[PDB]
């Protein structure tokens, strides 16, 4: 699996690929690993699919509830703190996952949460077996000053590189942009494919 989340001045870009393996056996080429979980919040999942999928549903429920009760969206750091507490509560029988939580409140944020509830904020983050390859691309090519279009291209490149070198990663690249203005928009497939061609790439 490869997931990535980056922040720019007023945006958050999150992307994943879609491969699901049982060992070397590619059982599903189009699983879903990027989810909207609130108006301006997205989550990526890596690790044990069952544990991840349960957590996706809990977060959808818990944030929808919070928003009705409070009439404001949960702060992104509050979402991360909630996951932090849930995962740590069960550390000795853990959710075997790596989570990225990204969104906009008064500012853009990306948080990376591990299976023991450790949560750290960062300007960018990647998770899954393909993440080291993404970290390479991002160290070399990421700028804070990037435009949203430049960011979408950057993540497409990072995940394309990870797909080329991690057999546990593959399938269509899946991208969401999160802005105050339009909210959580999942880019359409035409558009992603189009940029894969314009950048000169594959899968």
Residue 153: C-alpha distances to residues 31, 58, 88, 157 (Å)? 22, 31, 35, 6
Q: Are 163 and 2 in contact (CB under 8 A)?
A: yes
Taking the C-alpha atoms of residue 54 and residue 58, their distance in angstroms, rounded to an integer, is 6
Q: Residue 62 or residue 179: which is nearer to its own copies going by CB?
A: 62
2 included as an active-site residue: no
Q: Map residue 88 onto helix, strand or coil.
A: helix
Q: Residue 64 or residue 122: which is nearer to its own copies going by CB?
A: 122
Q: Are 130 and 122 in contact (CB under 8 A)?
A: no
Burial of 61 (0-12, 13-18, 19+ CB in 10 A): exposed
Q: Residue 30 or residue 182: which is nearer to its own copies going by CB?
A: 30
Binding stretches for its own copies (CB under 8 A): 19-22, 24-32, 48-54, 57, 81, 84-85, 87-88, 91-93, 112, 114, 116-120, 122, 125, 129, 132-137, 139-141, 157-158, 160-162, 164-168, 170
What the block records as the tokens of 47 is 């690790």
Taking the C-alpha atoms of residue 152 and residue 122, their distance in angstroms, rounded to an integer, is 18
Q: Residue 80 or residue 178: which is nearer to its own copies going by CB?
A: 80
Q: Shortest Cβ distance from residue 31 to its own copies (Å)?
A: 5
Q: Map residue 143 onto helix, strand or coil.
A: coil
Catalytic residues: 1
């Amino acid at each position: 699996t490869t997931t990535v989340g980056i922040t720019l001045k007023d945006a958050v870009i999150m992307a994943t690929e879609r491969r699901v393996t049982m060992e070397n056996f590619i059982m599903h080429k189009n699983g879903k690993k990027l989810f909207q979980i609130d108006t301006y919040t997205g989550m990526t999942i890596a690790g044990l699919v069952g544990d991840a999928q349960v957590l996706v549903r809990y977060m959808k429920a818990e944030l929808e509830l919070y928003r009705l009760q409070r009439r404001v969206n949960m702060p992104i750091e509050a979402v991360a703190t909630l996951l932090s507490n849930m995962l740590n509560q069960v550390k000795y029988m853990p959710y075997m996952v790596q989570l990225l939580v990204g969104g906009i409140d008064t500012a853009p944020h990306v948080f990376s949460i591990d299976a023991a509830g450790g949560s750290v904020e960062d300007i960018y983050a990647s998770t899954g077996s393909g993440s080291p390859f993404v970290y390479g691309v991002l160290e070399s090519q990421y700028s804070e000053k990037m435009t949203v279009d430049e960011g979408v291209d950057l993540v497409i490149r990072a995940i394309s590189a990870a797909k080329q070198r991690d057999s546990a990663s593959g399938g269509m690249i899946d991208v969401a942009v999160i802005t105050r203005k339009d909210g959580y928009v999942q880019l359409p497939t035409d558009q992603i494919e189009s940029r894969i061609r314009k950048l000169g790439l594959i899968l």
